[PDB]
Amino acid sequence: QYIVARPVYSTNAFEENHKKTLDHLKVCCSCSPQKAKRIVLSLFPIASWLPAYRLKEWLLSDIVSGISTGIVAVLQGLAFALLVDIPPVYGLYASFFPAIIYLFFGTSRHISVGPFPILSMMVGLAVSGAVSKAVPLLDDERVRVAAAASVTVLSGIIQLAFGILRIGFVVIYLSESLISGFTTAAAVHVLVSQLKFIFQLTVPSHTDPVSIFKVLYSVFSQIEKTNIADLVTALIVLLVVSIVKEINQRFKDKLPVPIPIEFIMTVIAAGVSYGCDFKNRFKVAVVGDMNPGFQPPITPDVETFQNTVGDCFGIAMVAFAVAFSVASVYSLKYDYPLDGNQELIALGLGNIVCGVFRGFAGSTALSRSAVQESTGGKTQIAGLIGAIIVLIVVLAIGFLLAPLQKSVLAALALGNLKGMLMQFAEIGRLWRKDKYDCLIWIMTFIFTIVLGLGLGLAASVAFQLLTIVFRTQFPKCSTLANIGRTNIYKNKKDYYDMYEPEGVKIFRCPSPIYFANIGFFRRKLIDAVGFSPLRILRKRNKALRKIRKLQKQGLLQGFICTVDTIKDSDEELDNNQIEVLDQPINTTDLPFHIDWNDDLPLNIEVPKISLHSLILDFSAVSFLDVSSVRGLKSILQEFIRIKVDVYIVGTDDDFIEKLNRYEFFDGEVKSSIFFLTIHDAVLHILMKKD
Amino acid sequence: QYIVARPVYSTNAFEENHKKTLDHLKVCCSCSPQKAKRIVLSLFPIASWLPAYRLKEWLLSDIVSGISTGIVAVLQGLAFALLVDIPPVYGLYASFFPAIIYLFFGTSRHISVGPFPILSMMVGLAVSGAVSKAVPLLDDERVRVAAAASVTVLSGIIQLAFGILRIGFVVIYLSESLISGFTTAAAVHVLVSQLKFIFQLTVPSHTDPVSIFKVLYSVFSQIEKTNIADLVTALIVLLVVSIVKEINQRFKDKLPVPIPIEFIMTVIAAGVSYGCDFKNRFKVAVVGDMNPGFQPPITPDVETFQNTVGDCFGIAMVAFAVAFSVASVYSLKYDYPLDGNQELIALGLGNIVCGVFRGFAGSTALSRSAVQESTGGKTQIAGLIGAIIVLIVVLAIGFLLAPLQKSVLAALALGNLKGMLMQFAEIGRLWRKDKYDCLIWIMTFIFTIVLGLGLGLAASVAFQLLTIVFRTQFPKCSTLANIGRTNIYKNKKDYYDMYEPEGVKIFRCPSPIYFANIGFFRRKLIDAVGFSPLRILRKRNKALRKIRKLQKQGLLQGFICTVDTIKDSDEELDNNQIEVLDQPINTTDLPFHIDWNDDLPLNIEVPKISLHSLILDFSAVSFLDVSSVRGLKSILQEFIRIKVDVYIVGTDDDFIEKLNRYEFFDGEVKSSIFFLTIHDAVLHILMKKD
Ligand SMILES: CC(C)CCC[C@@H](C)[C@H]1CC[C@H]2[C@@H]3CC=C4C[C@@H](OC(=O)CCC(=O)O)CC[C@]4(C)[C@H]3CC[C@]12C
Ligand SMILES: CC(C)CCC[C@@H](C)[C@H]1CC[C@H]2[C@@H]3CC=C4C[C@@H](OC(=O)CCC(=O)O)CC[C@]4(C)[C@H]3CC[C@]12C
Ligand SMILES: CC(C)CCC[C@@H](C)[C@H]1CC[C@H]2[C@@H]3CC=C4C[C@@H](OC(=O)CCC(=O)O)CC[C@]4(C)[C@H]3CC[C@]12C
Ligand SMILES: CC(C)CCC[C@@H](C)[C@H]1CC[C@H]2[C@@H]3CC=C4C[C@@H](OC(=O)CCC(=O)O)CC[C@]4(C)[C@H]3CC[C@]12C
Ligand SMILES: CC(C)CCC[C@@H](C)[C@H]1CC[C@H]2[C@@H]3CC=C4C[C@@H](OC(=O)CCC(=O)O)CC[C@]4(C)[C@H]3CC[C@]12C
Ligand SMILES: CC(C)CCC[C@@H](C)[C@H]1CC[C@H]2[C@@H]3CC=C4C[C@@H](OC(=O)CCC(=O)O)CC[C@]4(C)[C@H]3CC[C@]12C
Ligand SMILES: CC(C)CCC[C@@H](C)[C@H]1CC[C@H]2[C@@H]3CC=C4C[C@@H](OC(=O)CCC(=O)O)CC[C@]4(C)[C@H]3CC[C@]12C
Ligand SMILES: CC(C)CCC[C@@H](C)[C@H]1CC[C@H]2[C@@H]3CC=C4C[C@@H](OC(=O)CCC(=O)O)CC[C@]4(C)[C@H]3CC[C@]12C
Ligand SMILES: NC(=O)n1c(O)c(C(=O)c2cccs2)c2cc(Cl)ccc21
Ligand SMILES: NC(=O)n1c(O)c(C(=O)c2cccs2)c2cc(Cl)ccc21
């Protein structure tokens, strides 16, 4: 049973009966020989797991996973190089250099970095913006490569500058409702942007607010020019891949290393396209012969930095958020301490080295990481084998992809959109849960469809921040009362036999009071008390001025009258003199001790007040700002001058220690109004009144 | 003394011992004859105070205040029409039509609407943007008037659309730190923009990111062309007005209706400029003769709506925020119910009627409202007399301002910048108070100086919203303990003789848990408990799998061994099989009842745990979202499967009623874990353990 027999404490009788107990530059600038061995081995993390490498139980699994992710990285390299309007050889450069740099500088053991379609589509939008903003067949796709490389270099520089300044916690402003709303709209963007390769149409590059319908108009105005031999091949590839992926999602009994339908269908499509001369019989958009070898490095152009300095921030944000959210899943499994700041440095170095050698930007993909982890990827040596496969495709076997339809690539990339399109079926899962994150989802989807991918992310983040203000805009403030003659105080409109003491009003605001809900708090407090205290103070001051005017006239003196009725000379105060009606009342010059409650002398009318104390339950108020401290001080000054005691209960110690440095406590609003709980304020009032 | 002898309640034993107690379209669509008389008399509020008009005590004071504000409105009309590059006659139209419309449609009794310099400067920027974006001496200032009228019409339409949709609470996103940071930067903008009239220079219109230094470069590159006869006159006017304003701020004894130095200095300057032929002796920039009469109305141009649709939103926001913050001061005095939604409708109608008749936009000014209220303005009839004065200046006495220097106007408008420039001396008043609103002030000032007035307001609002996330990003989570063997639980690192029970950990997070602080909450909870529970669950599952493998081999059977030492066959789990290490443990198929704490059989190693229950004090957690509910459910599922009881205390009723519709409670995380306070959870643990 709950038995308590303590005295009544009031936060100053408690702090005197139980006694309590440069700034950062001398702990962060101490050059020690034990700290450099931590800093270097956390900056260059290949010296930490490569000596501690269990060879005999990991090498074969890493080799198998490396081959099985290198084939997928080759097939996804020259398929994401079509979302950018560059030749498809520049997609193989994008999946080789970051996989080499992340081997030396990365912390995650299970992701395989390369390109992934949302970031390559954002790069494809930014390069068309840089082309359309620059001052003055093969000469068009030269400046596309030369500007995509510079967009990649600038995004890597931004990511490296994030990683050096140790701001790796920027992923927490990217809640999963915003990610789930951005991802389906990016999937719709991919599905629309890959229509011009299935139908084999010619679409000009659009870079504007809404461009998901400009591409739709430019495609659907020339449906009569659709190559049937490309559409039939893309439809045949698309329904086989979905059926075999459905079979691979089910049927997982006696089935190790599930059947790769993408590689098999690509081999079959390339063999058919070579054997029957599909470039000459029909007229298809075949992937031409790539130059065997790498390209010499280019200097990044300066005039395209100043044109796309806004899009590279969004590219860096998306490339860090995706590569953190994917890697944290495999970090919760296997229990390794993934470091957020080193990921930005590794991805920035990988993107810089990729952009110097004419690649394009990218981070890890969810499907390639799932292929690398599901087939037994133990460490990042599988990424090295996956990069060696792309190296041997670039150097030697480049002619084997020369009879590739370029519509089977767009059909394969439309294959695994079902993972990002099923999240449409969660709005109903969010409508019956919060109705604020459903709003965040809907507004993120609308802003990403309409305002593109660069501006839509910033607009959805700015709305996600406004949602938190919407949550605490109109709090459900209530009035409390006692249940069962004990220390249980709950809401008055809930239980039956609640007892409320005489002249005590316990008020509770269940939200942190800041600038958007201080006026609402004041209005709700005035409506719950029953009067405005400034109105009663002004009427009391008017009555006191009339009383002392009658005393100066020689009528009053307790307070006996001479005549029964006087004239009702309502001396109204003009401007620049009405501010004396807000002054505190002093009755030291009078012999009587008026209380403004029983009655007054002749034709003096003052509204009555039954209160003598109110209690503010501030147990849920988390913080205050200058506007709340100013408004709260203005409220308590009206409540104290009206002879009503105020108590603020339920606060802990650093709340009072923060309120000390707000110039809150003066000779009127003393520091002895803070009590511990609600019940020892009611007990203090009851032991003070009698 | 505090004596309590209640039983121990657990939010389900409490709700069964004390029994408790279309949606809005049928209360908002009820056409009643008593509701129309409220709606019309709140929409057309001149029918409410004009019959209730105490004539014999208000008429003379309203006439005096009307004359004294009409002179100031005339002198401020054709001085704010120089911040826009229009002829000065179009400033007298801006202070006449809104004062007539606000008489019929306004609620405040003490503001005098007209132009005010921040909004006219924003109009002057937007009109230059509309000129510089339009496709193709007197022909330049024709399109300035024709585009400023359309910017005014669009801003009035936006304000009227705000007032009809009843969103009049948008001023609460405009905290006083943001207003105080925006106002001084607007004052610096006014002081720089009025330099070309003192020196009498020719400056082209700049409309861009940063333009406070483009005007400074265009002025200070041609200092050698400064008219000395204008600079000397502006300096003579400027130091007299400041001295007499200092004398008027002090010396307020036997001094009614303080001496207007602006009208006297304007009369003296005009008389000197006429008597000595200042347009011919020197070569000054005198205010030319205005056409006597109004202008016929124009249709607003459509092509300039689409160019400045972004700036008109900022003009409407500033025009509502200033006219609300000024009117609320005189609404707190005199006690009248000012309505926020009617102010938007009245200002929108005033701006529309002003923009049709070739005026420009505006709301009330602080100085004109102070002049109208301080001289005895009782109602809005003083605004009507102030408009009649502007009418008689436009119609008849227009030649009296024709010898006006146009540098004395810029010198007068630099006079009362001291009210908006002294707020520089509050950063030190905000540095020792919060250091978040000092940051809001500094970032608002920097964004308004750099990004102009239109974009700077939006950027400072977007940073003000981010400040609230910065306040609750890293909360100061703590561990509590008991003081003095009673129901007082406070922070463990504060007091000396705090007692903590055996195996109980009371944890407290003093912030609402949302998406930005759920990972920090999980990391702080794991660091305060002392272990990760998923690690102990995985090691317990590995040990249990080894135990049952030894049982299948025929060695174990309580739990006696056969041999002393076995081989250390560490059967490590591959991928797609390691997720069985997170499953709950069941020991129903074993005869023994292992507890994972004392010891285990041969070479089995499990980490020990001293906990058996932890308590989460959620009294300060105001709300949750889907990310917090998901992460909290994931935390409690690890803590329950490890055989550690969890209790969540300090929550009130609608917190549990909200958590019901989150799919939070299942067969594992039952609803019986919620307790009332901290002490009756500790008492429940102590009465359950023995
Ligand atoms: C939820 C909503 C309110 C958020 C804000 C949406 C706006 C950002 C969208 C909605 C309508 C859009 C406009 C709809 C149509 C057009 C015409 C379009 O014209 C062309 O592409 C050229 C046509 C030609 O040259 O003939 C240019 C973009 C624009 C202005 C769009 C710009 C982006 C707008 C303003
Ligand atoms: C806000 C969401 C929910 C709906 C979006 C509706 C509109 C904003 C969209 C739908 C149809 C779109 C239009 C569809 C086709 C075109 C043609 C397109 O191409 C041209 O005009 C090329 C030049 C020419 O041929 O004249 C320019 C964009 C435009 C006007 C689009 C502008 C944006 C529009 C009006
Ligand atoms: C804290 C985050 C938001 C990054 C820091 C702010 C950036 C958004 C700013 C700071 C430096 C700025 C740059 C400073 C100088 C220039 C050169 C300038 O070159 C010109 O040709 C001038 C005329 C013009 O293009 O407007 C173009 C803008 C640019 C790249 C600016 C683009 C915007 C930048 C990158
Ligand atoms: C958000 C924070 C952590 C980012 C910190 C880094 C940025 C402040 C720097 C990194 C690289 C900088 C860029 C490096 C080079 C240039 C080119 C420079 O071009 C010129 O001056 C034009 C010269 C010419 O046209 O001849 C304009 C600034 C800009 C875009 C810089 C803008 C500022 C950037 C993005
Ligand atoms: C606190 C800071 C980081 C906030 C972001 C600041 C930017 C929005 C500012 C800082 C530097 C500014 C730039 C500094 C100089 C110029 C050159 C200026 O050039 C001209 O006016 C034309 C010159 C010519 O024609 O010769 C155009 C604006 C611009 C790009 C400014 C645009 C606005 C910028 C990028
Ligand atoms: C961010 C805050 C704290 C400091 C701001 C520093 C810069 C962003 C400012 C200071 C000096 C400014 C410059 C001062 C003078 C000019 C000349 C001005 O006029 C012309 O160039 C006209 C055409 C010509 O004559 O070439 C254009 C803006 C510019 C470059 C300004 C651009 C913005 C600058 C670099
Ligand atoms: C909820 C708040 C933020 C207001 C609602 C959204 C507005 C910001 C949008 C909705 C309608 C939009 C307008 C819809 C159509 C047009 C015509 C369009 O005309 C053109 O010549 C098209 C090409 C172009 O200028 O880009 C110019 C943009 C404009 C005015 C748009 C400007 C932006 C507007 C006002
Ligand atoms: C924030 C919410 C509450 C505002 C609600 C009102 C707006 C949605 C409306 C009110 C007036 C509208 C404007 C009225 C007229 C026009 C002109 C119109 O011009 C054309 O279509 C061009 C025709 C041509 O060039 O021939 C473009 C949209 C625009 C700016 C409209 C944009 C949308 C506005 C601002
Ligand atoms: N598992 C696997 O081998 N693959 C995929 O999952 C692919 C996708 O459709 C992706 C959509 C978003 C990221 S990947 C894919 C595409 C090609 Cl061209 C070759 C192989 C592929
Ligand atoms: N009280 C008064 O009569 N006046 C002022 O206060 C003036 C200002 O400087 C203002 C600065 C911001 C708003 S007003 C002012 C200017 C002129 Cl041209 C004529 C009279 C004036």
Side-chain angles (χ1 to χ4, degrees), chain B residues 206 209-211 213-218 446 449-450:
Chain B
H206 305 287
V210 54
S211 89
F213 297 131
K214 304 212 268 169
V215 181
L216 266 176
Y217 182 74
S218 297
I446 285 175
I449 282 297
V450 171

Short mmCIF file of all heavy atoms in Angstrom, two decimals, chain B residues 206 209-211 213-218 446 449-450, ligand 6:
data_model
loop_
_atom_site.label_atom_id
_atom_site.label_comp_id
_atom_site.label_asym_id
_atom_site.label_seq_id
_atom_site.Cartn_x
_atom_site.Cartn_y
_atom_site.Cartn_z
N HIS B 206 18.11 48.42 -58.65
CA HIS B 206 18.67 47.09 -58.49
C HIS B 206 17.67 46.17 -57.80
O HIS B 206 17.12 46.52 -56.75
CB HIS B 206 19.97 47.14 -57.68
CG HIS B 206 20.99 48.09 -58.24
ND1 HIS B 206 21.71 47.81 -59.39
CD2 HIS B 206 21.43 49.29 -57.81
CE1 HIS B 206 22.54 48.81 -59.64
NE2 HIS B 206 22.38 49.72 -58.69
N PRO B 209 19.38 39.37 -55.19
CA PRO B 209 20.25 39.18 -54.03
C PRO B 209 21.43 40.15 -54.05
O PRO B 209 21.82 40.66 -55.10
CB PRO B 209 20.71 37.73 -54.18
CG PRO B 209 19.49 37.06 -54.75
CD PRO B 209 18.74 38.10 -55.57
N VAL B 210 22.13 40.22 -52.92
CA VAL B 210 22.29 41.46 -52.15
C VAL B 210 22.29 42.74 -52.97
O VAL B 210 23.07 42.92 -53.92
CB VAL B 210 23.55 41.34 -51.27
CG1 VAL B 210 24.79 40.96 -52.09
CG2 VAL B 210 23.79 42.61 -50.51
N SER B 211 21.38 43.63 -52.60
CA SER B 211 21.18 44.92 -53.24
C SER B 211 21.36 46.07 -52.27
O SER B 211 21.16 47.23 -52.66
CB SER B 211 19.78 44.99 -53.86
OG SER B 211 18.84 45.49 -52.92
N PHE B 213 24.28 46.61 -51.05
CA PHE B 213 25.62 47.06 -51.40
C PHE B 213 25.73 47.50 -52.85
O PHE B 213 26.70 48.18 -53.20
CB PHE B 213 26.64 45.96 -51.11
CG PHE B 213 26.73 45.59 -49.66
CD1 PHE B 213 26.68 44.27 -49.27
CD2 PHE B 213 26.86 46.57 -48.69
CE1 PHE B 213 26.75 43.92 -47.94
CE2 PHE B 213 26.94 46.23 -47.36
CZ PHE B 213 26.89 44.91 -46.98
N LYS B 214 24.78 47.12 -53.71
CA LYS B 214 24.77 47.64 -55.06
C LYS B 214 24.36 49.11 -55.07
O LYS B 214 24.92 49.91 -55.82
CB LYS B 214 23.83 46.81 -55.93
CG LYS B 214 24.17 45.34 -55.94
CD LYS B 214 23.83 44.71 -57.28
CE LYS B 214 22.44 44.12 -57.28
NZ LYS B 214 22.04 43.76 -58.66
N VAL B 215 23.38 49.47 -54.23
CA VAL B 215 23.01 50.87 -54.08
C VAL B 215 24.13 51.65 -53.41
O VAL B 215 24.40 52.80 -53.76
CB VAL B 215 21.69 50.97 -53.29
CG1 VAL B 215 21.25 52.41 -53.13
CG2 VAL B 215 20.60 50.19 -54.00
N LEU B 216 24.84 51.02 -52.46
CA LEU B 216 25.98 51.66 -51.81
C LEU B 216 27.12 51.90 -52.79
O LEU B 216 27.78 52.95 -52.72
CB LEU B 216 26.46 50.81 -50.64
CG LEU B 216 25.89 51.19 -49.28
CD1 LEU B 216 26.36 50.22 -48.23
CD2 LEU B 216 26.29 52.60 -48.93
N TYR B 217 27.37 50.96 -53.70
CA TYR B 217 28.40 51.17 -54.70
C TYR B 217 27.98 52.22 -55.72
O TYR B 217 28.80 53.05 -56.13
CB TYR B 217 28.74 49.87 -55.42
CG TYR B 217 29.85 50.03 -56.43
CD1 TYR B 217 31.17 50.19 -56.01
CD2 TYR B 217 29.58 50.06 -57.79
CE1 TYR B 217 32.19 50.35 -56.93
CE2 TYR B 217 30.60 50.22 -58.71
CZ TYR B 217 31.90 50.36 -58.28
OH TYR B 217 32.91 50.52 -59.19
N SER B 218 26.71 52.20 -56.14
CA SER B 218 26.25 53.17 -57.12
C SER B 218 26.15 54.58 -56.54
O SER B 218 26.21 55.55 -57.30
CB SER B 218 24.89 52.75 -57.68
OG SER B 218 25.00 51.52 -58.38
N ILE B 446 20.99 38.95 -40.81
CA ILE B 446 21.89 38.59 -41.91
C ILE B 446 21.11 38.21 -43.16
O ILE B 446 21.45 38.64 -44.27
CB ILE B 446 22.83 37.47 -41.44
CG1 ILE B 446 23.90 38.04 -40.52
CG2 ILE B 446 23.50 36.77 -42.61
CD1 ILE B 446 24.80 36.99 -39.91
N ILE B 449 19.56 41.48 -44.63
CA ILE B 449 20.56 42.31 -45.28
C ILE B 449 21.02 41.68 -46.59
O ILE B 449 21.10 42.34 -47.63
CB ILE B 449 21.74 42.56 -44.32
CG1 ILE B 449 21.36 43.63 -43.29
CG2 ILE B 449 22.99 43.00 -45.06
CD1 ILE B 449 21.06 44.97 -43.89
N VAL B 450 21.27 40.37 -46.57
CA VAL B 450 21.83 39.70 -47.75
C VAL B 450 20.73 39.35 -48.74
O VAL B 450 20.75 39.78 -49.90
CB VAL B 450 22.64 38.47 -47.33
CG1 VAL B 450 23.01 37.65 -48.55
CG2 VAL B 450 23.88 38.89 -46.59
C1 LIG C 6 27.78 38.63 -46.41
C2 LIG C 6 28.09 40.01 -45.83
C3 LIG C 6 28.48 39.89 -44.37
C4 LIG C 6 29.18 40.71 -46.64
C5 LIG C 6 28.86 40.90 -48.10
C6 LIG C 6 30.10 40.96 -48.97
C7 LIG C 6 29.86 40.80 -50.48
C8 LIG C 6 28.81 39.71 -50.73
C9 LIG C 6 29.54 42.16 -51.14
C10 LIG C 6 30.44 43.30 -50.59
C11 LIG C 6 30.91 44.13 -51.79
C12 LIG C 6 29.83 43.84 -52.82
C13 LIG C 6 30.01 44.34 -54.25
C14 LIG C 6 30.17 45.86 -54.26
C15 LIG C 6 29.97 46.45 -55.62
C16 LIG C 6 29.47 45.80 -56.67
C17 LIG C 6 29.37 46.48 -58.02
C18 LIG C 6 27.96 46.42 -58.56
O1 LIG C 6 27.84 47.14 -59.84
C19 LIG C 6 28.41 46.73 -60.99
O2 LIG C 6 29.24 45.87 -61.10
C20 LIG C 6 27.85 47.49 -62.16
C21 LIG C 6 28.42 47.17 -63.53
C22 LIG C 6 29.88 47.51 -63.71
O3 LIG C 6 30.23 48.70 -63.55
O4 LIG C 6 30.67 46.59 -64.00
C23 LIG C 6 27.48 45.00 -58.63
C24 LIG C 6 27.55 44.32 -57.26
C25 LIG C 6 28.95 44.37 -56.59
C26 LIG C 6 29.92 43.47 -57.37
C27 LIG C 6 28.80 43.93 -55.11
C28 LIG C 6 28.50 42.43 -54.97
C29 LIG C 6 28.37 41.98 -53.51
C30 LIG C 6 29.63 42.31 -52.69
C31 LIG C 6 30.85 41.54 -53.22
#
